[PDB]
Design goal:
Helices cover about 50% and strands about 5% of the residues of chain A. Chain A is mainly alpha-helical. In chain A, a hairpin with a 3-residue loop joins strand 2 and strand 3. In chain A, helix 10 packs across helix 11. Chain A is globular, with a radius of gyration of 22 Å. Chain C is mainly β. Chain C has a single domain, classed as Beta Barrel (Porin), CATH 2.40.160.10. Chain C has a nine-stranded mixed beta sheet with strand order 8-7-6-5-4-3-2-1-21, covered by helices on one side. In chain C, strands 9, 10, 11, 12, 13, 14, 15 and 16 form an eight-stranded antiparallel beta sheet that branches. The relative contact order of chain C is 0.13. Helices cover about 5% and strands about 55% of the residues of chain D. The chains are: A mainly alpha, B alpha+beta, C mainly beta, D mainly beta. Chains B and D meet through strand 1, helix 1, strand 8 and helix 6 of B and strand 7, helix 2, strand 8 and strand 15 of D. Strand 1 of chain B pairs parallel with strand 15 of chain D, so a sheet runs across the interface. It is classed as translocase. The entry lists the keywords Mitochondria, translocase. It forms a tetrameric assembly. The mitochondrial SAM-Mdm10 supercomplex in GDN micelle from S.cere.
């Protein structure tokens, strides 16, 4: 099918803030069979970095030659598998008896496991401050650097809130300035409050990460397990971001306590097999001056949303 | 604390007009004392044409209703202190979502919609493959149904299913004139509360943000048509793969009670929302399955 | 806060001379360094209901509509000329904040020409906190001793600021002891007001101390210009050696053509590596206050907590 | 002319709240009726603010049209456990030293009722009569208010009687009637001892064709509270379902009050008074057939209370700090022994 895929990365490869963009680059790189090439030939990967080209503000967009926009990794894969022309290796096409389970596994990573990667990308304070908020300086344009990571951190807080976590000013001014003793110990109140409340949060994250990876791995062991599916590329792109963050060795410590190191190192050698592949299957472009996201081409798009 | 020098019996005068409204909205599951009975709060109730039962007009409320009849061995109501089913407003909760469960009288517990969803998926959490299908119906088939009923049906079809406001035939009374004005004034606020139930507002932030807004511009209308077309294309693929998942070995599974509760509410819509047209024409095996699943809860 | 500018307006009206107080000894090092940056767009309108009653209202983007009802009666009949910054005087002040039902109160009694009494209650209903503190203070022209009793722990206290000797080497101390925790406190400060002939400027060198913590502070504070000011605090620590070097460089301006008044305020830290900026513009009744903060550790600058603050009052 | 300002409401139950208010005295060119327009912005509840447009227009020297367009959201019953929204318009005509006026109005309002009480507070706001009243309703109401006020002051009177008669007709739905008598009398030199008596009564009838369409909880009578029969909590009297005040169809409430002006000579000549009171009343669902069975219920077993306290009576608000004991009560009333604080405008 003929279209143009819009992603989040820069200069050769997808960004770590978008696990759906990483899985799509691995999807297009792994379409090596003739029926797998038949649904991927002429897709024109563009790293445009603007969600204004999306129907819902998410940026694996498939803008396809008519105005037909299919957005998100699971929607694109279900769309591209529907347009197989019809008539083993590096990517399998599921049969008709397994289309429901493989869509169930793709949707389960999308709604349960990818919820936890956006926790560790925005709501982990070690990962957000060191890595994530200073990553949009290289992706976006000169004024629009500080509103996008604040939005995605607000959206990750709404998606994760139910599983993971002026007289009072005049009081302490008449107390702690009249103390000068728990003046300095006033901040010792709240950061000693915060530290055992943050190990509180990391325990209920890591219980929710442990159950969602266990639920997916037990259902994945119903299809063929020696072959690569679309469900695996979205699952492995979630480990690749979570184990590759600044706080990513906390997770690899805990994931071998539950699943072992003969499974975490079998999943990390599949990931490193996918990152170190050539971009010969990748047919790329540069964003034109309708697709960039500049100061002038995001004021036209802002005025178009209210007209 | 000797100061109330006389205390009387509590006070036993009740508003009889309130007790007639509650009896109008109450439906009784047949087949314990005062305190072991629960009331299921539902959006509305429709009469099934085939059996004559009183089913809830929403797939989530109907699934909880079928799961309550299965767990306790009840019989569906017909459109001495038995349990009950209440037709309620969404506004009976802070959460504004309405499968809710009202258990007890003096020690009365209220389980909200999030609480029942945790209770319902905890009974299938041991089987991992059934949890994937349950998550697929509650996300992909759910989001189609909500978008077909918020955006593709008329306001009268929505308020027929998702409102406890009264519905007569036609306008003959001045009381019918302002009941027709509540269904136009309040239809949008009832649609906005429905988008906050299964975290639909977080999966679909931009089409929910275009709801909360006047004049509905052309850019918002063509982006909405792209999302709703992908949601419907994905849901024909769900519904066609569900047709090879209907064999039974005894009691219905909670997945089978969730498949049946979606088909029974899609085939109750009176408008061609394209989910009804697809299920009636192509999913004739799913329609017969939902009739077989329901008739082991009737008498 | 509002209770501390009611208090300073009563001090300038009855001539209490709080420059000798041991809470204004490091005052130029708190005005030039430790000011507050707004964190959101914030509007505020203030009013006057009765002759002795004031209404406030504020709403921000972060927080919706709040308000307050103040009561203020005083014998000092020159007080509200000072509310924009022998006869025994008194001040009575109370205020309720009412989305919160949070109360606050203040009674000042000048009992003698070299003696004052003060009460300061604060009563929150939830976030439950009832605090009632007393301030007895005997002024002189070489001392401003002060006896503070609180109800936080059971905190009793004492302050003194012995002025010596324009050139004025003061010397102060404070001694707190919370009588239910038995946790003492202490301090010692050594401000030294001077003058010079460089640009037209005083100077204020301020050696502080804290013997229970070892936290030695030090503050230089010049006035390098007819409107510009400067403050270079060098902080330190003992037994856990750790330096810091703050800065602060406020600039003023005034206008004609009902007079505009612009204040620009920078404050660089080095341990936290920040740079706070703040503009404040006054008018007849309006007051706009825009301010940002930067963090300097490619694009090394990140603007944390921008904020604007509109304000009207009459 | 423009007059942007702020102020304080002194609401329901001790609940002061801030408003922002704009004015505009319209110039007499788009006129020849003297018109002024208001916009009062208030804090609503948790999602929306409260907006309140008003347009007062003098037709004659003794007539004022008031078009009030409102969108207001507020909390309600006992633990602020009920969230009420109101959208509508109200056209009102008010006809004319003793205050005497008639006011006929006509109001259409869409009212939403949300149970905002958490499921943690488990049987509170979760009775069957509270789950059944949540929802949306639309209602046109016709009203009349007669006020005859011969008191010398309204917030701190020393003599004079007051009579206020309120009627409300929702056509085919309900008819509501309320009376309020208040008599003030003083016997000493500079009105040192003031005796105040208040009587409030009310009747509500369901005009709705064999008791269909029940009357909403916001349209029923509620008793108890600081600005009502003191020494009970607000919504603390009348019939109950579990613990929820279901309201009443008829009520009587009365109150005696003695003020004494604090005989310490420096704190005299002030607004502070030494306050003794006796309060009481009955709240009843009146078995909507006859008016002889209704008065038999309103005269049987009242809920009374007495108490001493201190009161400030300013023209802008009344502050009360009483120590109250309940004399008689029912077994399921919210009985508030000891100290009670009151803040508002209308005490009875």
């Amino acid at each position: 099918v003929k279209g143009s895929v819009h992603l989040w990365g820069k200069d050769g490869k997808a960004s770590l803030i978008s696990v759906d963009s990483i899985a799509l680059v691995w999807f297009i790189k792994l379409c090596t069979s003739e029926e797998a090439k038949s649904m991927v030939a002429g897709l024109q990967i563009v790293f445009s970095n603007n969600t204004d080209l999306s129907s819902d503000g998410k940026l694996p967009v498939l803008i396809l030659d008519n105005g037909t926009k299919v957005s998100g990794y699971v929607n694109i894969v279900q769309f591209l598998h529907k347009n197989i022309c019809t008539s083993e290796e590096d990517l399998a096409i599921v049969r008709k008896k397994d289309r429901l389970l493989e869509y169930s596994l793709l949707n389960y990573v999308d709604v349960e496991i990818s919820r936890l990667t956006d926790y560790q990308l925005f709501l982990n304070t070690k990962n957000y401050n060191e890595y994530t908020k200073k990553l949009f300086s290289k992706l976006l344009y000169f004024p629009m650097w500080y509103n996008t990571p604040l939005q995605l951190r607000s959206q990750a807080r709404e998606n994760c809130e139910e599983i993971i976590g002026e007289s009072k000013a005049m009081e302490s001014a008449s107390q702690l300035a009249q103390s000068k003793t728990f003046k300095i110990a006033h901040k010792n109140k709240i950061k000693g409050k915060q530290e055992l409340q943050q190990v509180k949060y990391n325990l209920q994250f890591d219980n929710r990460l442990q159950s969602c990876v266990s639920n997916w791995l037990a259902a994945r062991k119903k299809l063929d397990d020696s072959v690569i599916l679309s469900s695996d590329l979205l699952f492995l792109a979630n480990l690749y971001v979570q184990l590759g963050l600044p706080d990513g060795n906390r997770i690899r410590s805990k994931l071998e306590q539950t699943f072992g190191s003969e499974l975490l190192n079998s999943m990390s050698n599949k990931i490193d097999d996918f990152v170190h592949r050539p971009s010969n299957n990748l047919e790329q472009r540069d964003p034109q001056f309708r697709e960039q996201g500049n100061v002038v081409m995001s004021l036209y798009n802002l005025a178009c949303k209210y007209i | 604390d000797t100061f109330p020098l006389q205390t009387y019996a509590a006070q036993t005068d009740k508003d009889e007009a309130v007790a007639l409204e509650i009896q109008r909205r109450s439906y009784t599951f047949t087949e314990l004392t005062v305190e072991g009975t629960y009331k299921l709060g539902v959006y509305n109730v429709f009469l099934e044409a085939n059996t004559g039962a009183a089913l809830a007009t929403d797939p989530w409320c109907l699934f909880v209703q079928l799961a309550l009849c299965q767990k306790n061995g009840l019989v569906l109501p017909t459109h001495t202190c038995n349990h009950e089913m209440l037709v309620l407003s969404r506004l009976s909760n802070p959460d504004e979502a309405l499968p809710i469960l009202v258990e007890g009288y003096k020690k009365r517990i209220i389980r909200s919609t999030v609480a029942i969803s945790e209770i319902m998926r905890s009974r299938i959490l041991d089987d991992a493959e059934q949890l994937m299908y349950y998550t697929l119906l509650d996300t992909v088939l759910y989001d189609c149904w909500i978008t077909q009923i918020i955006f593709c049906a008329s306001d009268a079809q929505f308020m027929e299913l998702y409102s406890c406001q009264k519905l007569s035939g036609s306008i003959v009374t001045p009381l019918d004139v302002e009941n027709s004005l509540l269904q136009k004034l309040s239809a949008k606020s009832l649609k906005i509360s429905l988008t906050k139930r299964n975290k639909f507002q977080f999966r679909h932030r931009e089409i929910v943000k275009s709801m909360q807004g006047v004049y509905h511009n052309h850019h918002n209308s063509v982006n909405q048509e792209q999302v709703l077309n992908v949601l419907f294309e994905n849901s024909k693929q769900v519904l066609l793969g569900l047709k090879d998942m209907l064999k039974s070995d005894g009691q219905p599974t909670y997945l089978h009670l969730k498949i049946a509760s979606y088909i029974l509410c899609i085939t109750n819509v009176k408008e061609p929302i394209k989910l009804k047209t697809f299920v009636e024409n192509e999913c004739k095996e799913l329609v017969q399955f939902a009739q077989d699943t329901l008739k082991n809860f009737v008498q | 806060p509002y209770m501390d500018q009611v208090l300073r307006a009563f001090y300038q009206s009855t001539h209490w001379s709080t420059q000798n107080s041991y809470e204004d000894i490091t005052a130029t090092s708190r005005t030039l360094l430790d000011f507050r940056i707004p964190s959101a767009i914030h509007l505020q309108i203030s009013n006057k209901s009765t002759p002795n009653t004031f209404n406030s209202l504020d709403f921000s983007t972060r927080s919706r509509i709040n308000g307050s009802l103040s009561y203020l009666y005083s014998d000092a009949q020159q007080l509200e000329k000072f509310m924009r910054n022998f006869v025994k005087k008194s001040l009575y002040y109370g205020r309720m904040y009412y989305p919160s039902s949070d109360l606050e109160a203040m009674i000042i009694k000048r009992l003698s020409p070299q003696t004052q009494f003060m009460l300061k209650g604060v009563s929150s209903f939830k976030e439950s906190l009832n605090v009632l503190t007393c301030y007895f203070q005997r002024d002189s022209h070489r001392n401003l001793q002060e006896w503070i009793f609180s109800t936080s722990d059971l905190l009793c206290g004492y302050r003194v600021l012995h002025n010596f000797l324009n050139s004025s080497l003061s010397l102060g101390a404070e001694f707190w002891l919370g009588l239910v925790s038995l946790s003492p406190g202490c301090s010692t400060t050594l401000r030294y007001y001077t003058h010079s002939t460089n640009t037209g400027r005083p100077l204020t060198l301020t050696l502080s101390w804290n013997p229970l913590f070892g936290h030695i502070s030090s503050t230089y504070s010049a006035k390098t210009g007819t409107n510009s000011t400067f403050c270079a605090k060098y902080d330190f620590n003992l037994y856990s050696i750790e330096s810091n070097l703050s800065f602060g460089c406020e600039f003023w301006q005034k206008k004609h053509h009902s007079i505009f008044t612009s204040v620009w305020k920078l404050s660089t830290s080095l341990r936290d590596k920040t740079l706070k900026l703040l503009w404040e513009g006054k008018w007849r009744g309006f007051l706009i206050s825009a301010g940002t903060e930067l963090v300097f550790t490619n694009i090394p600058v990140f603007p944390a907590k921008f904020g604007i603050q509109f304000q009207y009052s009459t | 002319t423009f007059t942007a300002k702020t102020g304080t409401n002194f609401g329901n139950d001790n609940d002061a709240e801030a408003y922002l208010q704009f004015e505009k005295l319209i110039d007499k060119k788009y006129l020849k009726l003297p018109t002024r327009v208001n916009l009062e912005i208030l804090r609503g509840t948790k999602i929306h603010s409260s907006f309140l447009f008003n347009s007062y227009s003098s037709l004659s020297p003794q007539s004022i049209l008031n078009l009030k367009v409102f969108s207001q959201f507020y909390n309600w019953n006992t633990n602020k456990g009920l969230d009420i929204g109101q959208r509508g318009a109200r056209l009102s005509l008010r006809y004319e030293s003793p205050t005497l006026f008639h006011e006929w109005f006509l109001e259409t309002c869409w009212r939403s009722t949300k149970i905002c009480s958490q499921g943690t507070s488990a049987p509170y706001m979760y009775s069957g009569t509270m789950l059944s009243q949540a929802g949306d309703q639309l209602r046109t109401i016709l009203g009349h208010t007669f006020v005859l006020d011969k008191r010398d002051h309204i917030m701190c009177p020393t003599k004079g009687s007051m009579l206020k008669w309120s009627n409300e007709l929702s056509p085919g739905k309900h008819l509501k009637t309320q009376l309020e008598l208040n008599s003030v009398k003083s016997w000493m030199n500079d009105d040192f001892i003031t005796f105040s008596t208040t009587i409030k009564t009310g009747y509500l009838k369901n005009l709705s064709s064999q008791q269909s369409l029940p009357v909403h909880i916001c349209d029923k009578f509620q008793s108890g509270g600081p600005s009502d029969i003191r020494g009970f909590q607000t919504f603390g009297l009348g019939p109950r379902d579990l613990y929820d005040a279901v309201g009443g169809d008829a009520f009587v409430s009365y109150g005696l009050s003695v003020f004494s002006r604090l005989p310490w000579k420096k704190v005299e000549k002030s607004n502070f008074r030494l306050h003794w009171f006796f309060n009481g009343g009955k709240l009843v669902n009146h078995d909507n057939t006859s008016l002889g069975n209704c008065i038999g219920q309103l005269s049987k077993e009242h809920s009374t209370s007495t108490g001493i306290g201190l009161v400030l009576r300013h023209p802008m608000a009344r502050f009360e700090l009483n120590f109250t004991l309940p004399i008689t009560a029912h077994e399921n009333d919210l009985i508030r022994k000891g100290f009670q604080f009151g803040l508002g405008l209308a005490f009875l």
